[PDB]
């Protein structure tokens, strides 16, 4: 069944190699792609090959690459190998690209995900020369049907001088209808429009990205696969964390601080997230609702079981198994899922209005409950802040969850001072590890420290943490947030020097 | 003429001392008061004396004090002198209260100002025993007309078990009508109402605070002045900063990145703020609009001249001469100013929608442009984060302005690593000192550092900053945000140990 239903736009079909030639050295390129879903695949590959060849000849050939969020080996991977990206934003998870970033070979800034569209329109990244977007189909009307994510695609389409569409036959035609694209002013020139969303399941727009066809310079027929999440079940540590949170949710409900169906939930990806979602699947809270960035295995299962009514997101992040399931039952799931532009899914105005519960991971937290989401030892990028700040600050409740240790016990997730800060004390109310849960609402910093140390820290590290805090209370410059500046970052340096935070 | 226009409530008038007897040890007390304006005065003084008396007899007497933001000598001052406050939130500028906080004698948490009402309703502060609110008048139907600020007063009235009103005849009767109080769900239980503000000059509510008269336990007739702080006359450092900033606005206009009337402006108070307001007054930009936390002297000047068309705020913050000016012309200024609940003035949804330009001060920034607004050496509280987070993250443009040094040259305002972080890199785009202006838009951390070091740091400290940076780039665990953890906080320790950050 022909995917390009606009007859005239079929004349714009050309090979991936020829399309890649439209991209010039120095260009700013905006692409689809979010949580490894719906990023362009073939043009980037071709571009990378031509970039390597050019380099060998002595011709500079790099681009600035702005995405929705993370992509995959075909985009981030290949361009990184070719050393073809001089600047990248706002979120990467490709190892090759991560290495370029951490070597200082590619410049990187991890903007709040919900702000990217607005900053792009304001001109922060420069003029967009190209928008390269993956499509499931093109409608008779010239509408562009997105694939497994929406991300920033509508904005990039608006901004770009020229547009390249990759129509990918690998993607399920039945995705058509699942997306909700608003034509209102969310991220454009002030004064912006009021975004009329008052319920997580409320659609406000249409199923297609809009673009002036005069701007489409090439359409490339492709056939390649998105990246998948791993099929891996939560361990005992994740389950313990999930148990503490579920008990908390229960107590809140019983105290009437949460409705029996809780509030719209924002969850992440990974073992902890999956344990929480697995817990909620069999939990006592009915008619749950999701207002998140991503649809993962967990949320799929609850939508399946009926324990969750609807789920809003910008993207998918599914195991091969889960992907097989949804593709077989797309007509069922399409009625349960809304995929939104990321500047809507991640809108602080909407998140606060709906009263979302934010549940996020972290690298580390200090004893006062400042959170590092990004930079190991304060300098080595992991993934990026992503939407954790959009949600943490705007949510009804901001919860951070993590194993109390990393690297086989050689690193403590609770430290005297975070080597880098992404979420300040004000943006984190609840902490959970396999050791217990710390409820920090209404507490001063010294009060926070007492809860975090006593409830959350691993027994191997707790006495060391208490010792730091007790000595700081005694000798710190001020006593409002006591620190010993000579040792605040010493555990981190000790890891660097010896490979462990534990004394020898 | 009579300020209490509802006859029934006149029966609840009583002496300040007697009213203060309603407040018991351990009570949570919510009061009016924001930037030195509109806080209760006589009841707190009476309370303080009774506390001191109890203490002398070995009897405990302390309260939890929750406010709009800063108060004055009659409130924060007296109670702190009496050691009568066990917990304080969210924002203080009184020097005695500051000492209690930094000595560990008063527990303190500086919540984001826009969030305080919401967290209070969620119960983070506990159950409110008392609301203590200053009024201009009481209307025929028992509405409470606020005075020189709105702050959190409507929310404290809703929550408190008992209410005490201070009717202050020092306050101008023609303040009635200047306030806009909404009965919509801004900070209550989700789902919240949409706050329909699409223009800075838009009113959405009415002129009075509402309260069940059955809750009013006392009314005190008073006559006492707000804290009208002396006008901070711009110095050459401030004039230079304003000069760089205004030059910057000028360039943005000519490149069509701002309209000729700029965008809604949020500014603070003091030296630099005053210099900026004077520059706008003399500047080329017409039809300016203020959407801020406070109205200051310089704003009044533009409203008078017609350079500014409207000013939205939660509070006044005026010198004696400005206070007298508006008092003789309250009818004129009443038409040009809207005072709002602080959960509306500081609403991220609205700030972003309007596209405000945020201009804020700081203690320090590190070379990567993370900002500390609160904690000296990381441990000693100054004032509090206030609304800087509300505005910085939500704004169209986030600007931080400061002298490049402090303590007469002995401290650098630009450092290797900030001792405490209030505003992450993502929340700060422009830095201005008397040395120059750093435009960070679209830059990676390393690129930010190169701009901050060259444009903003003081010549006394630039070489030291550059040497830290150079060696970090060579040795740091990762090269994305290079640091040397052995010396990142060493300048702060040097200051603690020697009284200067410069070496010997
Ligand atoms: C913080 C974050 C990296 C943790 O991921 P996670 O999978 O949930 O946690 P994990 O325990 O599995 O650890 C992930 C990696 O970080 C490393 N890590 C975690 N904590 C660490 C620490 N304190 N020190 C050093 N490394 C650490 C782990 O070693 C692991 O790396 P590895 O693959 O080499 O073993 C992740 O949540 C993230 O990138 N956050 C930012 C984006 C975001 O929050 N978006 C919001 C919704 S998705
Ligand atoms: C950060 C802040 C304290 C700066 O104040 P400012 O008026 O701009 O400039 P100042 O230099 O006069 O700061 C005042 C004090 O901070 C001290 N200070 C400033 N920078 C310092 C530094 N790097 N190290 C140590 N002390 C410093 C000054 O010495 C001064 O001390 P003092 O009160 O004993 O005289 C102030 O902006 C603030 O409290 N910010 C938080 C709230 C806010 O931004 N809300 C939004 C609208 S106001
Ligand atoms: Cl909105
Ligand atoms: Cl709180
Ligand atoms: Cl709103
Ligand atoms: Cl940016």
From Swiss-Prot, chains A, B:
One of its GO terms (molecular function) is acetate CoA-transferase activity. Induction: Expressed at intermediate levels during the first growth phase, when ethanol is metabolized and acetic acid accumulates in the growth medium. Up-regulated during the second growth phase, when acetate is catabolized. GO terms for biological process: acetate catabolic process; acetyl-CoA biosynthetic process from acetate; succinyl-CoA catabolic process. It holds the Pfam family AcetylCoA_hyd_C. Disruption phenotype: Cells cannot grow on acetate and have lost the resistance to high levels of acetate, a characteristic of wild-type A.aceti. It catalyses: succinyl-CoA + acetate = succinate + acetyl-CoA. Pathway: Metabolic intermediate biosynthesis; acetyl-CoA biosynthesis. Its EC number is 2.8.3.18. CoA binds at residues 268-272, 363, 383, 387, 407. Subject to competitive inhibition by coenzyme A (CoA). The keyword Repeat does not apply. The active site is at 293 (5-glutamyl coenzyme a thioester intermediate). InterPro entries: AcetylCoA_hyd_C, AcetylCoA_hyd_C_sf, ActCoA_hydro, ActCoA_hydro_N, NagB/RpiA_transferase-like, Succinate_CoA_transferase. It comes from the Bacteria. It is an enzyme of class 2 (transferase). SUPFAM superfamilies: NagB/RpiA/CoA transferase-like. Utilizes succinyl-CoA to convert toxic acetate to acetyl-CoA and succinate. Required for growth on acetic acid and for resistance to high levels of acetic acid. Also has low activity with acetoacetate as substrate. This is Succinyl-CoA:acetate CoA-transferase.
């Amino acid at each position: 069944t022909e995917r390009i239903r606009n007859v005239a736009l079929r004349s714009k079909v050309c090979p991936a190699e020829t399309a890649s030639e439209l991209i010039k050295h120095g260009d700013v390129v905006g692409t689809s792609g979010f949580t490894g879903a719906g990023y362009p695949k073939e043009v980037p590959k071709a571009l990378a090959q031509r970039m390597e060849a050019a380099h060998d000849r002595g011709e500079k050939y790099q681009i600035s690459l702005i995405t929705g969020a993370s992509t995959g080996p075909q985009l981030d991977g290949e361009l990184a190998k070719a050393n073809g990206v001089y600047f990248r934003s706002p979120f990467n998870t490709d190892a090759t690209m991560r290495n370029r970033i951490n070597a200082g070979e590619t410049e990187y800034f991890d903007n709040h995900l919900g702000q990217v569209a607005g900053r792009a329109v304001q001109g922060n990244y420069g003029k967009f020369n190209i928008a390269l977007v993956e499509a499931t189909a093109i409608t008779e009307d010239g509408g562009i049907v997105p694939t497994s994510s929406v991300g920033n695609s509508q904005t990039f389409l608006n901004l770009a001088e020229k547009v390249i569409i990759e129509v990918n036959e690998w993607q399920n035609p039945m995705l058509e209808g699942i997306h909700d694209i608003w034509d209102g002013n969310v991220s454009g020139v002030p004064t912006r429009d009021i975004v009329p969303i008052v319920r997580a399941d409320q659609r406000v727009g249409g199923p297609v990205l809009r673009v002036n066809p005069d701007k489409i310079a090439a359409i490339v027929r492709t056939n390649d696969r998105d990246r998948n999440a791993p099929f891996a079940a939560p361990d005992e540590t994740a389950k313990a964390i999930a148990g503490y949170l579920l008990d908390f949710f229960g107590h809140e409900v019983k105290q009437n601080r949460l409705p029996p169906s809780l509030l719209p939930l924002q969850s992440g990806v990974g073992n902890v997230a999956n344990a929480v979602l697995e817990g909620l699947k069999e939990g006592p809270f009915e008619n749950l609702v999701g207002y998140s960035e991503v649809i993962q295995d967990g949320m799929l299962a609850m939508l399946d079981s009926g324990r969750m009514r609807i789920a809003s997101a910008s993207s998918f992040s599914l195991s091969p198994e889960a992907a097989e399931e949804i593709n077989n039952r797309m007509d069922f799931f399409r009625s349960k899922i809304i995929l939104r532009q990321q500047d809507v899914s991640n809108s602080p105005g909407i998140i606060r209005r709906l009263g979302c519960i934010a549940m996020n991971g972290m690298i580390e937290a200090d004893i006062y409950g400042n959170v590092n989401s990004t930079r190991v030892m304060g300098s080595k990028m992991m993934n990026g802040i992503g939407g954790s700040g959009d949600f943490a600050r705007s949510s009804y409740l901001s919860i951070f969850l993590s194993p109390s240790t990393a690297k086989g016990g050689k690193i403590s997730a609770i430290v005297p001072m975070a080597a880098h800060v992404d979420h300040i004390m004000q943006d984190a109310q609840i902490f959970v590890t396999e050791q217990g849960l710390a409820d920090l609402r209404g507490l001063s910093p010294v009060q926070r420290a007492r809860e975090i140390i006593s409830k959350c820290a691993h027994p191997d590290y707790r006495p060391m943490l208490q010792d730091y805090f007790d000595r700081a209370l005694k000798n710190s410059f001020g006593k409002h947030t006591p620190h010993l500046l000579t040792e605040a970052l010493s555990w981190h340096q000790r890891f660097i020097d010896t490979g462990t935070m534990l004394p020898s």
